[PDB]
Amino acid sequence: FMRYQAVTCEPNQLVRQLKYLTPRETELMLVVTMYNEDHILLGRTLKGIMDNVKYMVKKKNSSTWGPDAWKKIVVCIISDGRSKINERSLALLSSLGCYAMHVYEHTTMINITNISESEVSLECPIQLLFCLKEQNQKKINSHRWAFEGFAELLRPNIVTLLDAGTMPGKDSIYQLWREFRNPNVGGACGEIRTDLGKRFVKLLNPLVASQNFEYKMSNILDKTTESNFGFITVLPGAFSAYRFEAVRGQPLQKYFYGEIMENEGFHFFSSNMYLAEDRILCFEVVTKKNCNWILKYCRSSYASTDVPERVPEFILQRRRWLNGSFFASVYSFCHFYRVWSSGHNIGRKLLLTVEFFYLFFNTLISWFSLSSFFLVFRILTVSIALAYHSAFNVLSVIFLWLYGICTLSTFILSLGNKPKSTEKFYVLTCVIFAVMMIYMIFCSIFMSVKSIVISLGSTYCLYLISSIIYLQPWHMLTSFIQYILLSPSYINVLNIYAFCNVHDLSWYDEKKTGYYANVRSLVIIFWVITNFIIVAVLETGGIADYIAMKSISTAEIPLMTSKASIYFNVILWLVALSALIRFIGCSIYMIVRFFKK
Amino acid sequence: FMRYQAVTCEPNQLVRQLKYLTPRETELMLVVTMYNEDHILLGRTLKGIMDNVKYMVKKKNSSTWGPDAWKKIVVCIISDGRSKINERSLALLSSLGCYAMHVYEHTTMINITNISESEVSLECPIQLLFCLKEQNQKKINSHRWAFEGFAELLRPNIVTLLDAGTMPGKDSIYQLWREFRNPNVGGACGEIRTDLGKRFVKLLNPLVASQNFEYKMSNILDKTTESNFGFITVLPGAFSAYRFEAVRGQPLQKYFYGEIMENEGFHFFSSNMYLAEDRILCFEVVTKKNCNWILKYCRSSYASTDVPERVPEFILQRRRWLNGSFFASVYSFCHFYRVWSSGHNIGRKLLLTVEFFYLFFNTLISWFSLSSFFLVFRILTVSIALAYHSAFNVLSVIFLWLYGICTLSTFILSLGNKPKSTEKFYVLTCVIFAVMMIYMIFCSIFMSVKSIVISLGSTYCLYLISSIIYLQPWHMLTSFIQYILLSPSYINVLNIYAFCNVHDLSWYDEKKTGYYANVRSLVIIFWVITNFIIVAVLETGGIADYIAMKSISTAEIPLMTSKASIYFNVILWLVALSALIRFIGCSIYMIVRFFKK
Ligand SMILES: O=c1ccn([C@@H]2O[C@H](COP(=O)(O)OP(=O)(O)O)[C@@H](O)[C@H]2O)c(=O)[nH]1
Numbered sequence A, B: 001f002m003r004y005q006a007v008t009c010e011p012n013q014l015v016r017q018l019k020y021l022t023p024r025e026t027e028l029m030l031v032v033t034m035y036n037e038d039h040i041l042l043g044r045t046l047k048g049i050m051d052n053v054k055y056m057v058k059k060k061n062s063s064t065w066g067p068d069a070w071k072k073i074v075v076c077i078i079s080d081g082r083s084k085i086n087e088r089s090l091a092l093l094s095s096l097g098c099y100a101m102h103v104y105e106h107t108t109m110i111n112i113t114n115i116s117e118s119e120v121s122l123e124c125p126i127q128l129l130f131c132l133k134e135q136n137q138k139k140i141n142s143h144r145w146a147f148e149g150f151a152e153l154l155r156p157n158i159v160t161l162l163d164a165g166t167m168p169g170k171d172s173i174y175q176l177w178r179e180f181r182n183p184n185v186g187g188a189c190g191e192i193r194t195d196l197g198k199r200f201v202k203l204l205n206p207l208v209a210s211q212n213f214e215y216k217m218s219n220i221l222d223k224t225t226e227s228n229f230g231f232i233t234v235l236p237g238a239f240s241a242y243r244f245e246a247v248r249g250q251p252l253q254k255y256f257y258g259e260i261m262e263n264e265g266f267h268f269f270s271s272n273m274y275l276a277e278d279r280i281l282c283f284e285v286v287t288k289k290n291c292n293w294i295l296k297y298c299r300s301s302y303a304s305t306d307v308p309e310r311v312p313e314f315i316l317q318r319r320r321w322l323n324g325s326f327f328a329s330v331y332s333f334c335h336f337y338r339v340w341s342s343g344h345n346i347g348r349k350l351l352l353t354v355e356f357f358y359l360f361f362n363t364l365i366s367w368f369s370l371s372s373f374f375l376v377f378r379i380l381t382v383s384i385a386l387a388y389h390s391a392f393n394v395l396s397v398i399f400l401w402l403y404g405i406c407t408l409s410t411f412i413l414s415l416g417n418k419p420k421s422t423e424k425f426y427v428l429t430c431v432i433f434a435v436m437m438i439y440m441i442f443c444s445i446f447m448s449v450k451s452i453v454i455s456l457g458s459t460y461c462l463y464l465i466s467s468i469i470y471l472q473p474w475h476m477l478t479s480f481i482q483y484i485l486l487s488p489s490y491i492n493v494l495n496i497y498a499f500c501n502v503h504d505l506s507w508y509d510e511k512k513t514g515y516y517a518n519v520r521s522l523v524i525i526f527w528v529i530t531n532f533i534i535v536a537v538l539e540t541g542g543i544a545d546y547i548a549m550k551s552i553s554t555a556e557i558p559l560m561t562s563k564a565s566i567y568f569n570v571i572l573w574l575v576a577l578s579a580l581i582r583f584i585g586c587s588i589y590m591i592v593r594f595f596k597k
């Protein structure tokens, strides 16, 4: 029998698991967010999930799992908007027997075992729950339905979040479950790999090989470092898991409804916490009152994602990430004091205070990223031009003028225009920034051999020793940095478009838009002016004029200022310190895991 | 009897004057454009008009006018949108017996003779035609109805255009009519005065006294200079008149429908001539094939307008004007060759070629206005700071940093934000620019007395000798420049908001918006980069770095470059040349008028 349920009231006022002779246990609930993904995309996740349940059922020596393991997993497919959905994937789900909200629950005895370039094969259990929405709402609404709703019907021990188009490994979800046997854990997630295509073909699209080294090394370094301390910045939306009893109560409330205490007028946080999504749950769980919850990252579980392969949609995607990380870090740091109001033991409290300071340190770096790249590029170019001379001086003003035209055009196109409409100019901007990176690397090697080299070798060797330690080093030659030429475009074209588009305006609603416009246009000017105060302490902005005039009072301006070398060696010292901290975190994670095992 | 007509088809497929036993002659048709003006505003124009017809009827020695003069004038009130209209003014018109289009025609035997602050008195002919639209369309649609429609019903000898809220003088419209007795004239207009308020009270709002010296001297100089040569740039929308037979045919067609020869794709002109409105009629009339039409400006007729008195709506209004002047001048110059394809006599052809070059020269100045003001301010400040030293150096970087913050904020607020939403910041920006102007004037006088002064005195004396010649010099002490402190804000805050908002986007329509966004974001970068090439030839932008590096190849950078003095004395020489040309034009206009009289 196939059943169906049409939800009509919000989750707060709102499953088959509970509707059973013996109350089933949601030992793990996997939430599949699908907006308008291609049939192959959404099919990929469900295909990866099946194999996981197969492994969970054919195990022998386990008190929790076994031949009856299939009962205690529920897969919820939360679809966002019927109108925009692709009927191809719906036909796929109907072949499985699975096809203001709709609810479809069925038990599919058939498994999808083959997925070619265009054909998916079905042959002859999985408890599927296909939740279909009526009208498009932000993903936060889907999470609202997941947590305010079906959680309290199911009473999950664990809740796992998946995106359609993501590949849970052959054995990922079971390894993810094995983390919560330790009672002090609150959340866990799995490493995300990029789909480099059959025979590593997509490794061609320079972007698909720039996001590959950006996902591989992020999973190698940041997740392990954060999980050592106890609070992981982002449980990634692709593949993450929270214990329900941990998140239950205050964290759900302040993640959904915003900061409760609010007047009619808007304040900063209570009116700007939408930017950081699924990054507030971590904070409100780890620093809970009278609780000692920890966040861990599970290495033995992996999921391989799809990546956008053309520059416009790349920028549109990363603008969400940059704003989320900024607002979440600023909030969670500005409320670091309640870490000490929790139930953590004193050692845990000290560890979490240290780590929160570490994250705010990282965000303070990512805010000065724009000026840091400009001064690295500009001092690196002027240095070769002021020692090599030759075609470097013309290439210095040429690249400066190219950098200026591209950057000014990036502000103007971000503020006034849209990315899809000017595609070839972005491709040219990325190529210009890539040849700028080639020029900076050329200057690096040339100046080094004719004489920074210690620090560059040290950071690359830390990368390599950590990458091999993680047992995934092939990426470091899979084009990686060779295709990381997109990095210049990571620092400038993505940040500019991110902060120039903080709030994603679409002109109670009008006053809301006006206030958001003012906050947007004010964070932009603070970004620009603070970065330029750093830049001007190069001594731009009439500061060199001022010093020259003072000297005249008792001359002419110099071209280079030690402040650039101090700011040049501080930047490298600082990035080497960050790499060293992350490598130490990964090494401790590995030693602990291997010793325990 | 009161009649009414509801137009349903566009003007192309479309009056009482023709519907008469003896065909009435539209010796002059006055078009009143009203959007949502206050009762007093629209009432002001109709009140000013009445007096005009009274004068026209009580004359004695005239072949055209006399006791029967009231018949040969038709007043058409073209209202743009019933929904947004104010019913107060409609009650006013109903008291007169006057109240996809509606048409009201009545003969009001009563006259409005008293208008107090809030009371308008009626006592006991005027042929009124109150044309009311169904749905809001751009003013160009109202002109479409005026010209494609009621013109060919009436067959006007003359068509005069008025705005609701504008005061035709005691005797203005008759003086305007007296211009077309000369057969070679094609268009004429009247001088526009600002309403400085009872006892010159509104002379307080610094803006109402900044637009006053901006209207008084514009009418004194530009209209007379242009009317000497034959082609007046803008017949001002407030009060202007065109002979119908002159405009009839090609000029109407290319003013309404755009450039006919067009493919599916967009080109520059055929897809960007909307910016210049009512500025294309002049071109297509003066340079008509096999015709020798002239444009003249009538001094003996005046109209006093209302002005916005707060900074937001000021900026919103002037952004239309700046874009219109730019696009019209660029088009009319890039088609200067057909001046020689006309029916003008060789002297007229040479005169019009010279004047078209003069207008394109003026627009070439108004395009480099932004860099000209920055270099005037910056060199003027650095000059005092490099000779006076003292508190000027700190005030140099302080004003530079204030100029930079205000200008960057102006770009960011123009591109991303709206003016109404950030009002106090614009008021502060205008005050900062005003104290910057006070500082520049202080530097001017201080450096002059301790030692530009010849040129400044010469231009002010040309202003004064011309202003008195025009018989309206009191304005030059009515605060004028004292309240022209808003000028800094004229050059920067208005131009920045004008070019940063070329096309007034509101995201066939989508491709249109994308193309307009690209053209907008491309004219912005050309504006910025061309101005900055001028700025960088100050030697900003690594150009001083380049020269220093070349010198090193065989040192350090200098603070000041003669290129600034050359660019400083060229700017003053050039503005003095423009003032001299305009004064000569006004003097010739006056001598000719007085000799003829
Ligand atoms: O506005 C959004 C963003 C995300 N999603 C859901 O979250 C997934 C993540 O989207 P995607 O991977 O295409 O890009 P991302 O949003 O991660 O940048 C989508 O597939 C949807 O299931 C959604 O429904 N609406």
Ligand SMILES: O=c1ccn([C@@H]2O[C@H](COP(=O)(O)OP(=O)(O)O)[C@@H](O)[C@H]2O)c(=O)[nH]1
Binding pocket: B032, B033, B034, B035, B036, B037, B080, B138, B139, B163, B164, B165, B317, B318, B320
């Ligand atoms: O978008 C517009 C602009 C102008 N007008 C008409 O033209 C007059 C001029 O408007 P106003 O004097 O208020 O400001 P301006 O448009 O001249 O800046 C208005 O009164 C209307 O009659 C209109 O109907 N719609």
Ligand SMILES: CC(=O)N[C@@H]1[C@@H](O)[C@H](O)[C@@H](CO)O[C@H]1O
Binding pocket: A192, A218, A234, A236, A237, A238, A321, A324, A325
């Ligand atoms: C701070 C940050 O980058 N967070 C992102 C998160 O937004 C994203 O959902 C996830 C994979 O989808 O990868 C994480 O690294």
Ligand SMILES: CC(=O)N[C@@H]1[C@@H](O)[C@H](O)[C@@H](CO)O[C@H]1O
Binding pocket: B192, B218, B234, B236, B237, B238, B321, B324, B325
């Ligand atoms: C080039 C220019 O400034 N033209 C304006 C015109 O747009 C305006 O309609 C008129 C008075 O309303 O005054 C003119 O000076």
Ligand SMILES: [Mg+2]
Binding pocket: A034, A035, A036, A037, A164, A165
């Ligand atoms: Mg997707």
Ligand SMILES: [Mg+2]
Binding pocket: A163, A164, A165, A306
């Ligand atoms: Mg995806």
Ligand SMILES: [Mg+2]
Binding pocket: B034, B035, B036, B037, B164, B165
């Ligand atoms: Mg009006």
Ligand SMILES: [Mg+2]
Binding pocket: B163, B164, B165, B306
């Ligand atoms: Mg008006």
